[PDB]
Amino acid sequence: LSSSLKTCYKYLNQTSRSFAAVIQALDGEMRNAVCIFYLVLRALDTLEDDMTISVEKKVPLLHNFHSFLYQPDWRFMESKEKDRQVLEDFPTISLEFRNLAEKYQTVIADICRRMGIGMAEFLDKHVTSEQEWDKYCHYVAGLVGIGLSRLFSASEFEDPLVGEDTERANSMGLFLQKTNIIRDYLEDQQGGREFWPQEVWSRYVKKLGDFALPENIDLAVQCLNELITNALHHIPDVITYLSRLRNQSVFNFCAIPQVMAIATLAACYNNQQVFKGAVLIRLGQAVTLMMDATNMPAVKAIIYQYMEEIYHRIPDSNPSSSKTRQIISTIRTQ
Amino acid sequence: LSSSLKTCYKYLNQTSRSFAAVIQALDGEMRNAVCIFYLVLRALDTLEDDMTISVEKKVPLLHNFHSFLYQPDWRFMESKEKDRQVLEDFPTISLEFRNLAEKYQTVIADICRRMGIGMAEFLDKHVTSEQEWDKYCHYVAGLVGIGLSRLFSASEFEDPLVGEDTERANSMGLFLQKTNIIRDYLEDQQGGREFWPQEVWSRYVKKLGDFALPENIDLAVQCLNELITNALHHIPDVITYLSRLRNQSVFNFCAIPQVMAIATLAACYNNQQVFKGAVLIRLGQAVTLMMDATNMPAVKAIIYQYMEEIYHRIPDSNPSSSKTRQIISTIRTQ
Amino acid sequence: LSSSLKTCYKYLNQTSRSFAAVIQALDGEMRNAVCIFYLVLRALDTLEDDMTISVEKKVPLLHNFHSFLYQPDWRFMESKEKDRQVLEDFPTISLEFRNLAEKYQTVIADICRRMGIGMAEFLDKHVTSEQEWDKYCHYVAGLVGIGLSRLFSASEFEDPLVGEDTERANSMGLFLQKTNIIRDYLEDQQGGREFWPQEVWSRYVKKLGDFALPENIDLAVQCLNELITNALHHIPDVITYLSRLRNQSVFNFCAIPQVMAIATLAACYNNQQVFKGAVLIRLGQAVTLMMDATNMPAVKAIIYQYMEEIYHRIPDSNPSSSKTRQIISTIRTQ
Amino acid sequence: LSSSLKTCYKYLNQTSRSFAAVIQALDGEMRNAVCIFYLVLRALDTLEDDMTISVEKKVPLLHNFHSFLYQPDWRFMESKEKDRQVLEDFPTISLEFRNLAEKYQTVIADICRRMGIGMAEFLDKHVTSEQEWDKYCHYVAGLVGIGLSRLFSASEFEDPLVGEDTERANSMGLFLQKTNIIRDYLEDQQGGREFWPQEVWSRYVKKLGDFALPENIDLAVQCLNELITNALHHIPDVITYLSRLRNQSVFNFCAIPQVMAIATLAACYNNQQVFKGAVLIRLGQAVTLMMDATNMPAVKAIIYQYMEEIYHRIPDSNPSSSKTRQIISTIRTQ
Amino acid sequence: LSSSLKTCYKYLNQTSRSFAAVIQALDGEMRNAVCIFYLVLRALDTLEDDMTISVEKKVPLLHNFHSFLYQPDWRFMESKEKDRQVLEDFPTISLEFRNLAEKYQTVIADICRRMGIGMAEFLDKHVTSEQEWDKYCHYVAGLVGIGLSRLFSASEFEDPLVGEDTERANSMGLFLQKTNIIRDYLEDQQGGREFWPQEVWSRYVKKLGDFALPENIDLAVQCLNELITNALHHIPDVITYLSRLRNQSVFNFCAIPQVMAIATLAACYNNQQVFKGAVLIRLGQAVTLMMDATNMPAVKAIIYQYMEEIYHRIPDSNPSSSKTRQIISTIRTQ
Amino acid sequence: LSSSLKTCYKYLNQTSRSFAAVIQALDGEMRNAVCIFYLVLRALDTLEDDMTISVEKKVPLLHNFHSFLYQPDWRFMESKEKDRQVLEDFPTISLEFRNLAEKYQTVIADICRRMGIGMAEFLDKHVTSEQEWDKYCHYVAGLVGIGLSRLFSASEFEDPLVGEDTERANSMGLFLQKTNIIRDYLEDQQGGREFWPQEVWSRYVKKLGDFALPENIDLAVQCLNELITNALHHIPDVITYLSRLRNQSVFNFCAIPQVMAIATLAACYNNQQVFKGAVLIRLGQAVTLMMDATNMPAVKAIIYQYMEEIYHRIPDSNPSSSKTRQIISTIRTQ
Ligand SMILES: CCCCCCCCCC[n+]1ccn(CC(O)(P(=O)([O-])O)P(=O)(O)O)c1
């Protein structure tokens, strides 16, 4: 019916290459709720990304973004990013946001608020310690997981526990984000963006940018393996999280990205290609050509199998080899 | 046990290369029920297609086909079509038809009678209006969806509603027929068969066969896109229909062909190759390699993903661009 | 937590490259139960396989393997087989075996006692009649199926009927073993092993090894087809068995190996390559890209598709063509 | 739909005072199957009864009754027994028999064939040994249990094991028949029918008819208790049988008669009234006012509470005192 | 917790002396939903029943009754009916109504609204045609069923299909009212209320009140029978409605009243005592002493039993006999 | 197969004319575990009740009874109670006790330990406060509830929460014990035993035994009514506890004794017969004539029905009317 809701879905498909379809597949109220949540986070992300907006203007935009959701006429016309249409026509998105049931608005507004604060905080600094890496990921990805989970429970399509266990939801985001950060080393390096924790790579080279130099390829891969080992620690929580889902549409929505992340990590482990270009998320065995990420047992199997793909490739000369075998060993046994 | 039932499945596999496996997977009595229904339909279809049979001779066979089901010895030995074995050894198929529970015989016979009338109606006239295109599609496919739906309900594997909502059942059939007609343009041309609505193609060229001429490709790809736009209007009903199924074997049965159809229209949209030869069904994104057509949310996700693939490519140029986008946008917001 | 248990899962992944993931995906208590049962069966299998162990020393080990499970200190240091470590560190395995709830212990020890006797019975003789082929397969695989089925029922995750139907459970194992025995012909020849039934192959050549000589290739393919035709007879039972399963993790665990087995038999049929190396398992139509092995209907469809793949390749001149079409016909129709 | 099927259910109600409701309450296919099976057996049984048909003419009819199922016009018009309508209009019944799926037809036909043989076999000879008592009951009731079990499995509403375990199915029937035989002692006598095994009652009196003589009322009660004791041996199997049932409608169908029989056996145990008229069905304690035979645990509890009503009233001075306690103790400990 | 909720349950047990216990057995959120829903419906009906209330004063109350649920202070102190307590203390009930989740409020509200209109629409006219009888019934009972079905679905305890199938829900309602009306003939006449359809009783006596004169008793028993025959046509839908339910508490809640109604109709069929006083409900056969109205097969059995209790007594004389036998034969055969 | 286990069950049926049935009806591992537990409790209880056993000799026996379970030869010969046979042949029972899985031995031993201690503590004192009444019941029955609840969980046939929540298991025992204590006032008094709390009965008469005197019948009924009101407070726990059971056999075992208790209190309420003899437990309404204590909803409906029976008989002048109405109102509302 609503032309503004029709427009919101036009942007979802425009700005969401993949997620768009699965989001539209969600049951009842979660559909519109997640669609708007995606769009509002999409806009916020657009502002953050836009480098033609001075820090002076950007900090206040990120900080107050959440309240823009309540100003019927607010819009932004100076963006030069590809997805800026959601900023220039924000009143439409913001208008549908205010149509959602109050309980959903509470969640979305709150996530935007905290996310804006966090993003503004990393506008000047880079990631230093592994602790800061968790904090960054938490702001841009963890909170998303917390928000979605809180939306799932608020709608009652999932148990209240899903939205209460913020640590598990946060792990879903961190895993996705750390995996992407690891995979996009080069693409980011060429974009002047740095995300790998300084306290980790500084143990290998002088500047993060050095991993692109062939003489460093070895060190680059060693660093690579250590970050991937770090990301692997989130698997227990991811499994716990997905095993609590009772709604099929919610499950497809959450499981698919997680499965895709493990496969990526698997494809990246001890792989020099990560520093030459984007890597080949590939095939799988005939025991994964037998299942899709649509039921938990199948997902556990898919995740465990990718675990071993990594375990089979752990070279003894790797500095983290011992730690990698260890965390994987722990994940199996639970 | 019965050797004639075995013969029947032999014919099923011969005539339904792809789909026999899905049919054979149906639970309990739906299995033979649909197998036989498929075979009697194939026979009726062969009689209709056979061009060596004059119209005056053919009409009585179509009108009385439903009754031949009760003539133990009736068989047809003069067809020259590829699937003529089903007409030549029809006594074997009608034998098994007569072994089905009476409540199923009634459904299959009723559909056969009506299909015959309609098939007769169209032996002399070509399809003119879009309204007539629905009628023709109703007779050769829409009725199959209504037939199958009442077998489902009568068998009790599905809710009584499935069989009662004839509009949605009819839509399932209409969506496949139109997709096939659209796809088979060239093959129907070189076979002297015209199915595209006259009131549509007669706005682009003087004679349907003209789209086969390289100098008209552009006008052809336009008419093509107007028909696909037409077809897209059934998706809301296809989704509603599928969302009511509860039996797994019946779900794979109904959902797989609808998904294959949407994928086919996606490939054909704004595609000149439709007029040069056979179109190959395209791969897919990474969020379609994760799921299959076995659960409702996954199928919706799939349908939507193909929706966007078409939407993306809608040239503002096209005379239908506005209507194409509008029907899709509408499918996305329900 | 338990390091000896963590060690068992290390051995599980070490000795089962392709199935550890599925086993680890089993619900609750079945996970450790099946893990241990696998390690225990792996050890026993390794003893039978080792030819550096004389028959007179092996018969006792096989007969009393079941009691070693209760001898905290028993291990075996003379194996020179690839999986010798499960034997060398058996105390860790038996330790975790004695931690399993009694209901599982009883079943596992029971299976080991009978498997041992059966394995020892065949150390001297080669398989003669087809009836003998089933006996051997019953000893090394059918009992396993029977064992697992009793574990499923004991855990309450599967109905008591699963474990009580030993006939069907036994067939699950036979279908799997015959497929592998058939596939590994060459590998077993070069290994000094002869499993193909003599009552059968002796009708084609003078000595089983003759099938390796390029001049007999044709007679080899004939025997190959006779044996494959033989194995197909278990399919009905496999289907019935799987259809009784109600737990997802159990279903996935039971269906995958069978599907893989069908795929294998389909690839080997009338295939010369069986006698010149290993056979490559191929993709398979688009209707198997639409579903996976996680639901009963989908599994039937995959099994039927593969059946047809074999059907279309039956050479009329094959001395078993009739019997092959016959058994495939029955499977299609039931 | 068909008035013939409508007519079949009219007769079902006319001839089955008690069980037409339960049969009509069976899910899907079992309904018509059991309905026809019942009518057919009633017709048969109505011939065996009719003393107005001469041995010479009755014997062949019993022997060939199964064959008339395939003769559209076969009927019988000289019967004078109460239920004669089924024979007079058997064509209606046979028509509906020929309309059931072949798998039900085969089951029913085979049972009638075998039952007709036994019936004829026991027209001349009375029951001699206890071995003969089992034989007689197997032919008139055991087979009914085997047949029904095979129908239940062929319909897939029940597990394959239900139809395969003919011993347990046979017991269901034997228990019901012996129970009734024992209780209808007198009624039998006036009708001149003698069913109590000779080898058992012969060790008490001169002619079975004696027990009716008020003076022998004491010896009659010892024989009564020995038969009841014999029957009791069937309970273990009854429990095993009912324990496999999974369909609620089949369970109600099977459990009830069994429960009503045990209650009967208990009402007749050590009761002199057996020889003075029809003995009635006693209510129960307060632990039976709480349960109904709709779940196995309750049926079990009920059976045990009846095993007790009998156990308590067991006279130490009865010849079978020890054997009765022996069997009841076994039933309790399983 | 709530003291006003406690009061609502005190009112529930007052107005629903028998059924209050079943409503209270409902799972989760349905408990309060149905409890309140029952109370507001009692209130509304109390208003429609009260005759000291002028037509033009009542019509507005019936039409706006639904809006009163949202006015904290609405109550009615001028009703002098027995349940007036729910009208004088409506604020306690409305307060608790306004406490139910909105999804439930919507339904109840919508139902009271449509029901109000309908009731008003009948305050003046009597029931003319049988069709009008369905409208009246649809207005006072049918909507109630539709409402309850939507609550069941909204609560997610029942499948969405339960709520969607409004026609079956309507019948559940109609079978109940038509039964009550038919049996309350006398009581209603002494109260100057007429509900039997005139187009039906007109064909018997000159004025509905004539059935009170003992001279017309026979014409009365004939009208009675033609009406019960009318009501029975609803049993097929009832059975279908009940068969779809998968929640135990909802089943008990829906089945019990329906079974009771069929017991009442059998008690009233061809019974003169309907015009002398109220008809009592009694025993039943021995196959009912073994089953309760808590499972579908047991409920069918019950229904089928009563179907027979009636058939058994359809006098050849009754002018409806033919039609009474038709519907019962059909109910037995589906 | 064990002759000793065979003797244990003979004793079970001997000592528990009721409970034995539902116990023998328990699934798998719980069957013997409960039979044994019931037997050790009966023995322990047979000592405590033996008045021919001096307090000095008794205390030791009670404190060390749990230790006799591990002493193969222990047996008491000087008992004069009816069940003395279980103490004299204790080795039999102690042997079977030792034959149980450790996890079951642990529960039964700990409970027998905690019980001997309490029974000894009350050997000389009487029940003063209502607090002490809860304590006395906790020792003789509450713990039995906690015992059973833990066996259920250990055996895993029930959720771990069942043995966890010791409070609800305690309430299950208190309810039965109090109901019994209340019903057995006279029989107890005549046997010189007193269990009613002094703090309660002292407010009516100078001595508990006085309620036995006709002149005190009214005072007796009032105190009776106050105690019944006390017991009614355990019903919410009784419901919560029953609502968590998933195993049918366990549910039957637990619900029936509870429903029997509720039925008994309802029949005892405001009833003079309590003090003149034992009370005969009447059936109920027709909507109890429609269910059985085998499913939660039914059980709830039954519990609630009886609550209303009590509610309707409450005398206004009764000193506990307010308290009784209060609690009934609460049970209704939860
Ligand atoms: C909002 C849900 C409405 C459920 C309505 C169906 C409840 C079934 C019983 C309805 N009702 C009407 C009359 N009565 C019967 C009685 O007159 P009542 O005193 O009202 O229980 P009784 O059975 O003679 O005690 C009960």
Tokens of B47: 């009689």
What is the distance of C-alpha F287 from the center of its chain? 28
Contact F104, F35 (CB under 8 A): no
Query: Residue C101: closest CA among chain F residues belongs to which residue?
Result: F101
CA C176 to chain centre: 4
Distance CA C263, CA E114 (A): 61
Is the alpha carbon torsion for F28, F34, F40, F42 positive or negative?
negative
Distance CA F303, CA D290 (A): 12
What is the C-alpha separation between C272 and C208, in angstroms, rounded?
Answer: 16
Query: Cα distance from B145 to chain E (closest Cα, Å)?
Result: 20
Rounded-to-integer distance, Cα E185 and Cα E211, Å: 9
Q: Among E18, E79, E74, which Cα is nearest to E45's?
A: E79
> What are the distances in angstroms from CA C320 to CA B198, C131, C183, C333?
55, 18, 18, 20
Q: Which two tokens stand for residue F91?
A: 């080795």
CA-nearest residue to B160 within chain E is E240
What is the CA angle D145-D148-D150, rounded to 5?
105
Long-range CB contacts for residues A145-150, cutoff 8 Å, separation at least 24: A145/A169, A145/A170, A145/A171, A145/A172, A145/A173, A146/A111, A146/A170, A146/A173, A147/A37, A147/A107, A147/A108, A147/A110, A147/A111, A148/A34, A148/A37, A148/A254, A150/A107
Distance CA D334, CA F9 (A): 10
Amino acid residing at D187: E
Give the position of tokens 């070490």.
C14
Q: Shortest CA distance to B127 belongs to which of B197, B193, B44?
A: B197
Q: How far is CA E53 from CA E40, E73, E140, in A?
A: 19, 21, 19
Closest CB to D22 among E287, E292, E308: E287
All residues of chain F having their beta carbon less than 8 Å from the beta carbon of residue E292 are 289-292, 298
Touching subunits of C (3+ CB pairs, under 8 Å) are A, B, D, F
Could you tell me if F331 and F236 are in contact, meaning their C-beta atoms sit under 8 angstroms apart?
yes
Distance CA D99, CA D108 (A): 13
Q: Answer whether E307's CB lies under 8 Å from E327's CB.
A: no
Residues 6+ apart with CB under 8 A from E17: none
Separation between Cα atoms, residue E128 and residue A64, nearest integer Å: 68
Across the interface, whether the CB atoms of E329 and D281 are under 8 A apart is answered no
Query: Interior CA angle at F15 toward F14 and F20, to 5°?
Result: 80
Encoding tokens for residue E181? 């009306």
D248 touches chain F (CB under 8 A): no
Judge contact between A249 and A24, C-beta under 8 A. Answer: no
Contact between residue C321 and residue C227 where contact means Cβ atoms under 8 Å apart? no
CB A158 within 8 A of CB A247: yes
Residue tagged 């498997």 (tokens): C115
Assess contact for D15 and D86: CB atoms under 8 A.
yes
Place of tokens 């002692």: D185
H or E segment and range at residue A134 = helix A130-137
Alpha-carbon distance of F116 to F63, in angstroms, equals 5
**What is the C-alpha to C-alpha distance for residues A260 and B287, in angstroms, rounded to an integer?**
9
Give the atom of ligand 1 at the shortest distance from the alpha carbon of E20: 21
D101 touches chain C (CB under 8 A): no
Q: Which residues of E touch D252 (CB under 8 A)?
A: 291, 295, 297-298, 301
Q: Which helix (H) or strand (E) holds E324?
A: helix E321-333
Residue E334 and residue E235 in contact, taking contact as beta carbons nearer than 8 Å: no
Ligand 1 centroid to Cα of residue E12, in Å, is 11
The total of other beta-carbon atoms located within 10 Å of residue D2's CB is 15
* Ligand 1 neighbours by CB, cut-off 6 Å: E 16-19, 34, 37-38, 41, 144, 148, 257
Reduced to 3 states, what is the DSSP secondary structure of residue B187? helix
Q: Record the tokens describing residue D294, joined without a space.
A: 């709709």
Token digits of residue C244: 């009784």
CB contact set of C262 (below 8 Å; sequence gap of 6+)? C235, C302, C303, C306, C307
- Count CB atoms within 10 A of the CB of residue B126: 14
Taking Cα atoms as reference points, which of A295, F124, B183 lies closest to residue C248? A295
Homologous superfamily assigned to C1-334 = Farnesyl Diphosphate Synthase (1.10.600.10)
The helix/strand/coil state of C36 is helix
Residue C133 phi/psi, 5-degree rounding, is -60, -40
Instruction: Let me know if chains F and A touch, i.e. at least 3 Cβ pairs under 8 angstroms.
Output: no
How many angstroms separate the CA atoms of E36 and E15, rounded? 12
Query: CA B126, B127, B132 angle in degrees (round to 5)?
Result: 140
Q: Which amino acid residue places its CA nearest to atom 20 of ligand 1?
A: E16
Q: Which residues contact D306 (CB under 8 A, 6 or more apart)?
A: D262, D263, D265, D266
Ramachandran assignment for A285, one of left (phi > 0), alpha (psi -120 to 50 degrees), beta (any other): beta
C-alpha A143/C-alpha A174 separation (Å) is 9
Please check whether residue E51 touches B, CB under 8 A. no
Respond yes or no: is residue D253 known to be catalytic. Answer: yes
Q: Are D301 and F252 in contact (CB under 8 A)?
A: yes
**Type of residue at F225:** N
| Residues B120, F37: Cα–Cα separation, whole Å | 81
Which protein residue's CA is at the shortest distance from atom 22 of ligand 1? E18
B192 torsion bin: left (phi>0), alpha (psi -120 to 50), beta (else): left
Question: Rounded to whole angstroms, how far apart are CA atoms B121 and B137?
Answer: 13
- Tokens (6 digits) for E228: 């019960």
First-to-last alpha carbon distance for chain A, in angstroms, is 49
CA distance F319 to F226: 8
For chain F positions 162-201, those within 8 Å of chain D (CB to CB) are none
Residue numbers of A annotated as active site:
136, 183, 193, 253
Specify whether the CB–CB gap between F272 and F217 falls below 8 A: yes
A19 at B interface, C-beta within 8 A: yes
For a ligand 1 pocket test, name from E17, E174, E178 the mutation site with the most ligand atoms within 8 angstroms of its C-beta: E17
| Nearest residue to A117 via CA among A188, A58, A35 | A58
- Output the six-digit token pair for C169: 């459970």
What is B237-273 written as a DSSP string? Answer: HHHHHHTT---HHHHHHHHHHHHHHHHHHHHHTT-GG
Neighbours of A243 (CB within 10 A): 11
Element counts in chain F: helices (H) and strands (E) = 18, 0
> How far apart, in whole angstroms, are the C-alpha atoms of residue E32 and residue E38?
10
Q: Pull the structure tokens for residue A284.
A: 């799988």
Give how far Cα E109 sits from Cα of A218, B195, E100, F225, Å. 71, 52, 12, 43
CB atoms within 10 A of CB C40: 26
**How many angstroms separate the CA atoms of A174 and F19, rounded?**
57
**Burial bucket for residue A313 (CB in 10 Å: 0-12, 13-18, 19+):** middle
What are E222's two structure tokens?
């004939």
Please report, for chain D, how many H helices and E strands are present, in that order.
Answer: 18, 0
* Cβ–Cβ below 8 Å for C103 and F29: yes
| E-C interface (Cβ pairs under 8 Å ≥ 3) | no
Nearest partner of A175 among A254, A292, A248, judged by Cα? A254
Q: How far is the CA of C172 from the centre of ligand 1 (A)?
A: 57
Six-digit token string for E172: 């559940």
For residues E198 and E209, what is the distance between their CA atoms, to the nearest angstrom? 11
In whole angstroms, give the CA distance from residue F210 to residue F189: 10
Distance CA A96, CA A114 (A): 21
Residues 6+ positions from F22 with CB-CB distance below 8 Å: D287, D297, D301, F252, F253, F256
CB-CB contact of D147 with D115 (8 Å): no
In the block, tokens 């209780």 appear at D183
**Positive or negative torsion for Cα C322, C323, C324, C325:** positive
Question: What is the per-residue DSSP string for D273-291?
Answer: GGGTSPPP-----TTSSS-
How close is the Cα of E19 to the center of ligand 1, in Å? 6
The Cα–Cα gap between E128 and C39 comes to 81
Which of C158, C161, C165, C170 to mutate against chain D (most D CBs within 10 Å)? C161
Distance CA C177, CA C143 (A): 11
Question: Is C122 in CB contact (< 8 Å) with chain A?
Answer: no
Would the CA dihedral through F194, F199, F200, F205 be positive or negative?
Answer: positive
Distance CA(B236)–CA(C222), nearest Å, equals 54
Q: Does residue C9 have an active-site annotation?
A: no
With beta carbons under 8 A apart, name residues in chain C contacting A330: 6
Terminal C-alpha separation, chain B:
49
Binary contact (E292, F292; C-beta < 8 A): yes
Closest among F274, F260, F119 to F188, alpha carbons compared? F274
* HSE (side-chain half, CA atoms, 13 Å) at A46: 24
Furthest-apart CA atoms within chain E: distance in Å: 62
Instruction: Report CA torsion sign: B231, B236, B239, B243.
Output: negative
CB B100: neighbour CB atoms within 10 A?
21
Q: Is E192 left (phi over 0), alpha (psi -120 to 50) or beta?
A: left
Q: Which two three-digit tokens encode residue F92?
A: 């039999």
- Nearest protein CA to atom 19 of ligand 1, as residue: E17
Q: At C177, which amino acid appears?
A: Q
Place of tokens 């077809």: B231
Q: Report the gap between the CA of E162 and the closest CA in chain B (Å).
A: 10
H helix intervals, C50-159 = 55-63, 65-68, 85-88, 90-97, 102-124, 130-137, 143-155
Helix then strand then coil, in percent of chain F rounded to 5, is 70, 0, 30
Residue with tokens 């010892």: D222
Calculate how close chain B gets to A122, using CA atoms only, in Å. 31
| The Cα angle at residue D6 between residues D2 and D10, in degrees rounded to 5 | 165
> DSSP per residue over F256-268, as a string?
HHHHHHHHHHHHH
Interface C:F, Cβ pairs < 8 A: 6
Whether the Cβ atoms of residue F291 and residue D290 lie closer than 8 Å to each other = no
Q: Choose, from E70, E193, E203, E332, the residue flagged as catalytic.
A: E193
Chain B residue with CA closest to A256: the answer is: B290
D21 vs E302: CB contact, 8 Å cut-off? yes
Pick C290's closest partner by Cβ from B5, B26, B292.
B292
C-alpha Rg value of chain D to the nearest Å = 20
Distance CA B333, CA D237 (A): 61
Helix (H) or strand (E) holding F102: helix F102-122
Type and span of the H or E element at F188:
helix F185-190
Q: Closest Cα of chain B to A28: distance in Å?
A: 10
Ligand 1 geometric centre to CA of C301 (Å): 52
Other beta carbons within 10 angstroms of residue A56's beta carbon come to 7
Q: Give me the torsion for CA of D94, D95, D99, D105, rounded to 10°.
A: 10
**Residues B271, B221: contact at Cβ < 8 Å?**
yes
For ligand 1, atom 1: residue with the closest CA: E38
Instruction: Give the Å distances, CA to CA, from C135 to C42, C131, C173, D322, F219.
Output: 20, 6, 11, 45, 82
Cβ–Cβ pairs < 8 A, chains D and E: 70
Helix (H) or strand (E) holding B30: helix B30-49
- C253 has catalytic annotation: yes
Among A32, A37, A25, C248, smallest CA distance to B288 is for: A25
Shortest alpha-carbon distance between residue F90 and chain D (Å): 18
Handedness of CA A20, A25, A27, A29 (dihedral sign): positive
The DSSP call for residue F279 is: P
- The CA E15 to ligand 1 mean position distance, Å, reads 8
Count of beta carbons in the 10 Å neighbourhood of residue B205: 16
Using a CB-CB cut-off of 8 Å, the residues of chain A touching B255 are: none
One-letter amino acid for residue B68 of the chain:
F
Contacts of C166 (CB under 8 A, 6+ apart): C146, C149
**Number of residues in chain F:** 334
Angle D239-D240-D243 (CA atoms, 0-180°, nearest 5)? 80
Nearest CA in chain C to F247: C156
Catalytic residue among C11, C183, C211, C241: C183
Q: Is D243 left (phi over 0), alpha (psi -120 to 50) or beta?
A: alpha
Locate the domains of chain E by residue range: 1-334
CA atoms within 13 A on the CB side of C294: 26
Question: Number of residue pairs across B and C with CB atoms under 8 Å?
Answer: 72
Task: Evaluate whether A33 touches A22 at the Cβ level (below 8 Å).
Answer: no
DSSP for C220-285 reads HHHHHHHHHHHHHTTHHHHHHHHHH---HHHHHHHHHHHHHHHHHHHHHTT-GGGGTSPPPPP---
Give DSSP secondary structure letters for D125-181. Answer: ----SHHHHHHHHIIIIIHHHHHHHHHHHHTTSS-HHHHH-HHHHHHHHHHHHHHHH
Measured in angstroms, the CA of E26 and the nearest CA of chain F are apart by 7
From residue B291, give the alpha-carbon distance in Å to each of B245, C81, E198.
19, 41, 62
